[PDB]
Each structure stands twice: as structure tokens, then as C-alpha cells.
Ligand binder design. Structure first.
Ligand SMILES: [Mg+2]
Ligand SMILES: [Zn+2]
Ligand SMILES: [Zn+2]
Ligand SMILES: [Zn+2]
Lengths: 255, 295, 88, 242, 49
RNA sequence: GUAUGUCUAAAGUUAGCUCUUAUUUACUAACAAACUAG
RNA sequence: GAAUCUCUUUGCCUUUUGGCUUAGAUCAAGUGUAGUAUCUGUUCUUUGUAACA
């Protein structure tokens, strides 16, 4: 397990890529750290680093310091200071999200600040108004490097990938729109998976395109909307009413 | 003569059947490009074949005057030239934009024009030949002249540009301040008029002259053609005009007075309207239903 | 005449319109007054106000219809009608 | 200069807590107006710094505190307390949250307590709706049948783990079917020992099958038109069981 | 005839060229808007949401 | 010729009359016989 | 005798002139090509009966 061992150095300091992005312009804007005088070619890229949870989990200083905010670069898979990082370098389990119960509707599980509503792109950190658990998973075209697959195999790959990242409520790949909808037991598992599979690939090492892994543009994990079919609205309303009845019991026990 | 009764069934797609045309001068086949499925051909009654190799719906399905192969303009960024006898692969134009109506010059089977929606038109042979970039908007519909040798283009702009046989530069660009656009247009078969729909619910008619200015009172006003890609039609040797609308109605027209004749109540916006070059009184129409009602 | 007299005469006209046609509870905490209002009377007032608005609408269209001195567009002939009404 | 709303749970189980005021600290996360921001630490040696993220007027418009963003009286989310007030009064009291910037500023500067804030504001109507709440509560692979869509994957993992002593799992919800998978030979023998038997999660019955085939998600169906059809046929097979 | 026709062309010149180009631009907005709705109705009868 | 304005999928959100045809006239053009803008 | 509809007149203005200064200021001295617009000239047109499902 991960409670026993210490967290590993996932990458050296010298083995990180530079913070200067890929050149998408003429000159480098050192205030916003971006490129200008031209916009042709994608800023977006396949991320070079993956998570690999069972190898790289472990006990950091964050367990010694008692802090229970997770590590944004463990989820990206690109921490330099492995066992010394102030944040947590393991999967969010039930007890850690249980200790996140006081602050996870204000901050996320990485210490980032949740904003008013979502972006126009529906991707980012998240809201304090929706108890959002479902992640839209698009961008599967370049995540497969435009390889012809059946939808059941892609759904199997997305199920096996997001099974590494916590407890799963429900995954449904859409064959007609080429996207998944990965719903989790907790909100913090959804936050951790959105940071985790940000711009990685669904490619297995058993396939021939493993050398040309970082060619296209990877996944697109984003926060999803409500599920607009009335059956999932029905299950949403009845699960929210059951959680409200639990909170009825809590409010009567309080006063 | 006028169409007056909704005669035959022809149950095509359960989807839209978004394109209907005829073989010129031999009214034997039709074409029907539905939303989900592929192209079907009805005779006169009978059926012939499907044309698999599309995934998305199809704007227009234009023949040649060689008539052996038609041209498919699908929404899936791909233009395919299909034989009417076997149905094989001549070209597969994988494009950049969703193509508009895809037409062919009456002289050559080589000469072959594809409209786009990124404001360009590409001429081809049996393979790029020459671009065409003067429309500012997405280009909607194309035509030609008697026996070709020039070319007609109209867009989501109000402009109509007569281009020539492989020449970028327009002879005339047709624009006023009150024109909506020209979303579809067919040559009147005396090959001297110039009819075109416009989303003031009106069918304008220009000339084919050097002094190219329009003629008054030949404007066909009583429609609801505002938000659908509705076709025009012409009878044998130019006796009437048929045109669909969004009232689930088909409207015919005279020439000298240009007034309403038959307001049929065909059971969804009636869009694709063709005459016969053989039968001098009957008109094939299809809306978004798929059932191809013949009048 | 004047807006006071004209309000008075329109009130007399609407009472003539009714002549051609023809409890109160409160809570403790909220104190909001619930008045029982009969549905026939509610939608009869609604149909009456819509009929008055449509009657005024059609009479105003009747005034809009009339065209019979020197003008370029429609607003101009309205302004010339205004000057012809100023000339007494 | 109003003092902040910070409830007893954000500050924590201490009596002497030293916070830091910054006048015109940051834009609040509701209306993007600046305000005096109070950041502190729950203990003296806490690693987490806790700051107010909304202004005082946005706090009193929702009757919520500024740090944990829950109710001042009840310490619960805004959406759920609005849902509870809708359960009580039979009136859909919803919190009208803005989306335009000028609408955010406009909706925060006005003197009103919007949403369900007025009910929990004074303690009298708070305890009135509380005993109305009391009046309401007085009134090595396997295949799985019979999974209604309200049964998650994590409950199917948790009940099988609870009946054992603690292994992956694949459930097609549009096909309403389930499957379980592991590697240990003795774990399947122990799963047979701790029982087509029935899994009882929350009285919802799930039938088990020893599935000798190695199922992928393709075994549950290749498409969505197969999933609903197989779900109907398998519910008819359940009626054949019954 | 030419001078009288030009005179009755210039007496019609009521709106300025900025008002003329605003009527032109609002006409272009309505034409682009109805073309956008035309394209959406085609894609909605198609099924592409 | 400027100011300035407008367009631009890489990323997929879940069920008398009708007509051809020429002359004339009017307004426009950084289009021609190295440079000129509010 | 009670009242509806249509007109005529009156009253309300109903798509009803929404700043200023030196009237704010000054007015072709060509051609060819082209575009746009208009005039004029020119030609053409005016149903019963029977059987079967
Ligand atoms: Mg200036
Ligand atoms: Zn770290
Ligand atoms: Zn605020
Ligand atoms: Zn709090």
C-alpha cells in the first residue's frame, strides 16, 4: 500500500522542461510569460509526465505536518521534491476527503480557489455552487493520435485509467459525440482526476505509437454539466433528496 | 402545365432527403441524400441502390451532362464523384471546410467546381487546378451558363459573381444595399434569365447580358423562404416556376405577370423541387420528411 | 380639457362599460392581506382591459390609415400635418 | 465597516485566534468587488491558512459565513438549505446567482437577504422551520444482473469488500449490468463461501453469475442501442426468474 | 430630364452616410443572423446538436 | 493612402405594353501618362 | 323604451424636426480604361355499366 512507504522523486530538477512555452510567436512576453505577434499552431500539447499511482505514492512531509491538501504536481506526475513536498503525494482516499469536509466546498483538494461559476470552456478549478462530481472527458481524437478504435475498447481504457484515481460512481462514453462522463463518489476525487489526466494520452505501451506518444494533443478533462436526460435528472433529484433527509436528521440532532 | 394533385408516394428516407435532382433531358432517375443514411435512386416506382461512403448529410447532388456520374456534396468535408451505373471511386476530395453545392462544367467531365464554406471555390480536373477567393462569406450556391464556359457563384453575402472558365476575376459582382443573400439559384432553360432565391421570401430574376441589370415586376413574392435552403425549379422550355417554402407548401408561378397559381398543402419545410424534362406537367418535391411527393 | 377632468370622464366611461356589463383575511406574522377575488371577475377585468386596448389599437390604426401637403417621407407628412394644424 | 461573518467551525476549537486584516484585500468570489480580507490560521502552528473569500454584503445576502461558505446558523451549503426550505414551505426558494459582471455588482450592493437567507436569519423562524423539519420527519470473473441506474460502481465495490475482508470492477449502467474481476485464486473461493446468489446492498437485489468468460466492456455491449435492448431483455429474463 | 432626375435623387438624400452605413450594417446583421439560423435548422434536421 | 471596423473548429457536453440592343449624360477609383491624407 | 355597429366634428400628437462656432469652412482645370445609375434611339409580343379483391 502507500501508508507504509515514502513518496518517490518523480522527476529531477534538471529533468523538468523549461517554463518558457513552445514558440507560438516571434518574441517572448515576460510579464504574462507567453508568446505574441502571431497565433498559428496549438499552445496545447501532450503532457510528458503521467502519474503512475501505485509506484509513486508514499508518505511525505505533508503527513508529518498534518496538512491534507494534495499535490498538483503529483497528479501531473512532475514533482521534483518527492518525499519533501509540503502537499500529499497519494490518491485521495475516504479518510482524507473526510478530513477535507470543512474546506472542500471553498477550496478544492489542491488548495486552489473555487470561483463563482465555471468558465465558458467549462474547464479549470470549479464552482462553490455545484457539488460537481462528473468530469467531461473529450479530446480523445488526439489522445489516440487519431487511431481507429471501437468505442467499447476506448470506454475500457477510460475506465481503467480513472480507476487509478479513486472511487468511481459512473462512466459512460458517448459513441456519437466521442466523449466520456466520469462521475466519482467524492468531489475531491473528481478534482484529482481532472488534474491527473490533464492532457495525457490513452495510449498503451503495448501499441506501436508509443514512441510518437507526445505528438498530437492529449485528453480534455473538464467539469461537466448536468445530465439532461430526465432519468438522470430523476436519479439526481432523488439522491439529493436522500442526502437532504440525512441533513434533516443532522439539523434536528443539532437543534 | 401546372401541378395540381399530390400523386405518388415514393417513400424515401425516414430522414431528410436533403437533395433532389434529375438526369438532364432523360427523366429516368432521381437522387435523395438523407440526414443519416446514404443516397437512394427512384425511377419511373422502383429502386436501384445505396451509395455507402458518407457519414453526414448532403447538401446537393449534381450531375454532369455526360450523366454517368453525379457529384455528392456532404457535410463531412468530403466530395465524392459517384457513377450512376456502378458507383465507384473517381475522386475523394478531403477538404478543409464543409463544402457547398458541387457542380460540373457541361463541356468536360474533367472540369469540376467545388464550393466551400471558408469563402473559397476550387476548380478541379480528373487534383487542384485553380482557387477562387472573392466572396467574403460562406458560399451558398453555384450555376453555369448555356453549355458552361463561364460560372456563377453566390454566397452568404448578398453578392453574386460571374466567374469565367478558370479565371479568378469576376466580370460582374452583384450587390445592392437591400439584398439579403442569394442562397439558391437555377438557370431558366431559355438560358437568358437568371433566377435566384432571396430571404426576403422573394425570387429575383436578373438577365444574362453584358448590361446585366435586373428587370422589374418579375419578382415572386408570396413565400415563406427565410430560414431553409430551398430549391428553385423550371419547367420544359420555361413555362412556369415551382418553389418550395416553410409552410409545408409548394408555390408555382407565371412569367409575364408573376402571380400565385397553386398553393398546395403537401404534408415540415418543402425545400427540394424539380421538374421533369420529359413529363410536361409533373413536379417532384421533398421537404424534411423524406416521403418524396410528386405533383 | 385637462388631465383631471379627462381622468374623471374616463372613469365615468368605464362605469358606463360596467353598466353595460352588469372577504379580507390577514396572517399574524406576515401581515399580508389575502383578498378573495372571484375568477369570473378577474378574467372579466382582464378581457375588458384587453378589449379596450384592442379597441384603441384598431381606432389608432384607423387614424394611421388616412393619407390625403408637401413631403418626402412618412415622418415628414406627419410634421406637415402638424404645421397645418398649427395654422388654425 | 462591518465585522465579518466567520462561524465557529472555520476558526476552530481555540479561544484566542489572531487574524490579519488587509483593507481592500481582493475581489470577492461572488460579486468581484474589493473588501477588507481577514486571513488567519486555525491553530498557531497550522499549515493551512484560511482566508475570507467573500465580502460582508455577499455574506449577509446569503446568511453565510465568509470562510467555509456555509450557513451562519446551520453550517450547511446554500443550495441544500434552499432545497430544505423548498421541502418545508412548498415554495421553490432558490438563490438567484448572477452571471454577468454588472449583474453581480448590482445584485450585491442592494439591501436585501436573497435566497433562503431570511428564514435562517432570525432564530425564531429558524426554530419554526426546525420543528417543521421534525414534523416532516414524523411524516476468476463474475457477472451481475439487476442493477438499477441508482446503484453506483463504488457501492458495488464497497459491499463486496465488506462481505470479504479487505479486485477491479466493470459496470455498464446503460446496459444495467455488472461485472467483477481479480487475480487471486483463493479470493474467488472465498467469494463463493461468503454468499445465482443475491447481493443485498440497500435491499436492492443483484444476482451473481460465475462468469467463466473473460469479459471486457464489449461483452456488455458495443454500442448504446445494444445496451438498452439488452437491459430490457435481461429484465424480461429476471421476470422469467420470478 | 437628367438634371431633374438628379435633383429628385438629391432631395431624397435624407439620412447621412453614417446613417446609411448603419442601415447597411443592420441589414447585414439580419442577413447573417438569418443565415446562421438557416444553417442551424439544417444541422438540427440533420441531428447534429 | 490612411485612421478605424468587420470575418476566420485545435478542443465534439450525456435523451399603351413585355423585350434585345447602341449612343449620350451623372458619380466614383493610390487604375496610367515614385511623391501627396483627415 | 334599454343598448351595439358605422360615420362626421372637436380634444389629445399618436413613427411629430433631439447641441454649438468663422451661414463651422472651401467648391471640377481635362483624357483613356472600368464600375454603378438613368434617359433616349432600336427590335419582338399582345361520366356510366359489368367483373374481381
Ligand atoms: Mg481629423
Ligand atoms: Zn508534490
Ligand atoms: Zn461580494
Ligand atoms: Zn464557516
Amino acid at each position: 500500500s502507500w501508508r507504509d512507504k515514502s513518496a518517490k522523486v518523480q522527476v529531477k530538477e534538471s529533468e523538468l522542461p523549461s517554463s518558457i512555452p513552445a514558440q507560438t510567436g516571434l518574441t517572448f512576453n515576460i510579464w504574462y510569460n507567453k508568446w505574441s505577434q502571431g497565433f498559428a499552431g496549438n499552445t496545447r500539447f501532450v503532457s510528458p509526465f503521467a502519474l503512475q499511482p501505485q509506484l509513486h505514492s508514499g508518505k511525505t512531509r505533508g503527513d508529518n505536518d498534518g496538512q491534507l491538501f494534495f499535490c498538483l504536481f503529483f497528479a501531473k506526475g512532475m514533482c521534483c521534491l518527492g518525499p519533501k513536498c509540503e502537499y500529499l503525494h497519494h490518491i485521495p482516499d475516504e479518510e482524507d476527503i473526510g478530513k477535507l469536509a470543512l474546506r472542500t466546498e471553498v477550496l478544492d483538494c489542491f488548495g486552489r480557489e473555487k470561483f463563482a461559476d465555471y468558465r465558458e470552456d467549462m474547464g479549470g478549478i470549479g464552482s462553490f455552487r455545484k457539488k460537481n462530481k462528473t468530469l467531461y472527458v473529450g479530446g480523445i481524437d488526439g489522445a489516440l493520435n487519431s487511431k481507429h478504435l471501437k468505442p467499447a475498447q476506448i470506454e475500457s481504457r477510460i475506465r481503467f485509467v480513472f480507476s487509478r484515481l479513486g472511487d468511481i460512481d459512473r462512466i459512460r462514453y458517448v459513441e456519437s459525440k466521442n466523449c466520456g462522463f466520469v462521475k466519482f463518489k467524492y468531489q475531491a476525487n473528481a478534482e484529482f482526476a481532472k488534474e491527473a489526466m490533464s492532457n495525457q494520452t490513452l495510449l498503451l505501451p503495448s501499441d506501436k505509437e508509443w514512441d510518437d506518444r507526445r505528438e498530437g494533443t492529449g485528453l480534455l478533462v473538464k467539469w461537466a454539466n448536468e445530465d439532461p436526460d430526465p432519468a438522470a435528472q430523476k436519479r439526481l433529484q432523488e439522491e439529493l433528496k436522500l442526502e437532504s433527509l440525512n441533513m434533516m436528521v443532522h439539523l434536528i440532532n443539532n437543534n | 402545365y401546372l401541378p395540381k394533385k399530390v400523386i405518388r408516394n415514393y417513400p424515401g428516407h425516414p430522414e431528410g432527403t436533403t437533395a433532389l435532382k434529375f438526369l438532364p433531358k432523360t427523366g429516368h432517375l432521381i437522387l435523395s441524400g438523407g440526414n443519416d443514411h446514404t443516397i437512394k435512386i427512384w425511377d419511373f416506382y422502383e429502386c436501384l441502390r445505396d451509395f455507402q461512403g458518407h457519414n453526414k448529410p448532403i447538401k446537393a447532388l449534381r450531375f454532369t451532362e455526360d450523366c454517368q456520374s453525379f457529384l455528392s456534396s456532404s457535410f463531412d468535408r468530403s466530395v465524392k464523384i459517384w457513377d450512376t451505373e456502378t458507383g465507384k471511386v473517381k475522386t475523394r476530395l478531403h477538404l478543409n471546410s464543409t463544402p457547398a453545392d458541387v457542380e460540373s462544367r457541361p463541356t468536360n467531365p474533367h472540369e469540376f467546381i467545388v464550393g466551400l464554406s471558408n469563402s473559397k471555390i476550387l476548380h478541379y480536373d480528373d487534383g487542384l487546378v485553380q482557387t477562387y477567393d472573392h466572396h467574403l462569406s460562406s458560399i451558398l450556391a453555384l450555376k453555369y451558363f448555356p453549355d458552361g464556359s463561364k460560372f456563377i457563384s453566390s454566397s452568404e453575402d448578398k453578392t453574386v459573381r460571374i466567374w469565367e472558365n478558370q479565371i479568378n476575376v469576376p466580370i460582374k459582382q452583384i450587390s445592392d444595399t437591400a439584398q439579403h443573400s442569394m442562397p439558391f439559384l437555377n438557370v431558366h432553360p431559355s438560358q437568358n434569365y437568371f433566377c435566384a432565391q432571396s430571404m426576403d421570401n422573394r425570387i429575383y430574376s436578373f438577365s444574362l447580358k453584358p448590361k446585366y441589370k435586373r428587370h422589374p415586376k418579375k419578382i415572386f413574392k408570396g413565400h415563406s423562404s427565410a430560414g431553409y435552403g430551398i430549391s428553385l425549379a423550371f419547367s420544359g422550355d420555361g413555362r412556369y416556376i415551382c418553389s418550395g417554402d416553410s409552410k409545408s407548401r409548394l408555390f408555382t408561378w407565371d412569367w409575364n405577370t408573376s402571380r400565385l397559381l397553386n398553393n398546395i398543402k403537401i404534408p415540415k419545410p418543402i425545400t427540394q423541387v424539380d421538374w421533369h424534362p420529359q413529363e410536361t406537367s409533373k413536379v417532384i418535391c421533398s421537404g424534411a420528411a423524406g416521403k418524396i411527393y410528386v405533383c | 380639457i385637462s388631465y383631471d377632468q379627462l381622468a374623471k370622464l374616463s372613469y365615468e366611461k368605464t362605469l358606463r362599460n360596467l353598466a353595460t356589463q352588469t372577504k379580507v383575511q390577514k396572517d399574524t406574522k406576515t401581515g399580508k392581506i389575502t383578498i378573495a377575488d372571484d375568477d369570473k371577475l378577474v378574467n372579466k377585468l382582464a378581457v375588458s382591459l384587453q378589449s379596450e386596448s384592442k379597441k384603441r389599437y384598431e381606432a389608432r390604426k384607423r387614424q394611421m390609415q388616412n393619407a390625403k401637403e408637401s413631403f418626402i417621407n412618412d415622418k415628414n407628412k406627419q410634421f406637415n400635418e402638424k404645421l397645418s394644424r398649427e395654422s388654425k | 465597516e462591518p465585522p465579518p461573518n466567520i462561524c465557529e467551525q472555520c476558526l476552530g476549537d481555540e479561544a484566542n485566534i489572531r487574524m490579519t486584516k488587509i483593507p481592500q484585500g481582493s475581489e470577492c468570489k461572488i460579486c468581484t468587488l474589493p473588501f477588507t480580507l481577514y486571513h488567519f490560521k486555525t491553530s498557531k502552528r497550522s499549515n493551512n491558512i484560511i482566508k475570507t473569500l467573500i465580502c460582508v454584503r455577499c455574506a449577509t445576502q446569503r446568511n453565510i459565513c465568509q470562510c467555509c461558505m456555509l450557513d451562519s446558523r446551520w453550517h450547511i451549503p446554500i443550495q441544500l438549505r434552499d432545497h430544505l426550505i423548498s421541502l418545508v414551505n412548498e415554495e421553490n426558494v432558490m438563490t438567484e446567482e448572477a452571471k454577468n459582471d454588472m449583474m453581480k455588482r448590482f445584485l450585491s450592493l442592494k439591501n436585501v437577504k436573497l435566497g433562503g437567507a431570511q428564514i435562517t436569519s432570525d432564530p425564531s423562524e429558524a426554530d419554526n422551520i426546525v420543528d417543521k423539519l421534525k414534523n416532516i420527519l414524523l411524516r476468476k470473473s463474475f457477472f451481475l444482473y439487476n442493477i438499477d441506474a441508482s446503484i453506483p460502481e463504488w457501492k458495488i465495490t464497497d459491499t463486496v469488500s465488506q462481505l470479504l475482508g479487505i479486485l477491479s470492477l466493470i459496470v455498464n449502467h446503460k446496459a444495467k449490468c455488472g461485472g467483477l474481476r481479480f487475480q487471486s485464486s483463493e479470493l474467488g473461493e472465498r467469494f463463493v463461501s461468503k454468499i445465482r446468489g443475491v447481493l443485498l446492498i440497500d435491499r436492492f437485489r443483484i444476482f451473481i453469475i460465475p462468469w467463466s468468460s473473460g469479459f471486457s466492456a464489449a461483452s456488455f455491449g458495443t454500442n448504446t442501442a445494444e445496451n438498452i435492448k439488452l437491459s430490457l431483455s435481461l429484465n424480461k429474463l429476471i421476470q422469467l426468474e420470478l | 430630364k437628367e438634371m431633374l432626375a438628379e435633383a429628385r435623387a438629391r432631395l431624397l438624400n435624407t439620412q447621412g452616410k453614417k446613417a446609411t452605413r448603419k442601415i447597411r450594417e443592420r441589414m447585414l446583421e439580419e442577413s447573417k443572423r438569418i443565415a446562421e439560423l438557416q444553417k442551424r435548422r439544417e444541422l438540427k434536421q440533420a441531428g447534429i446538436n
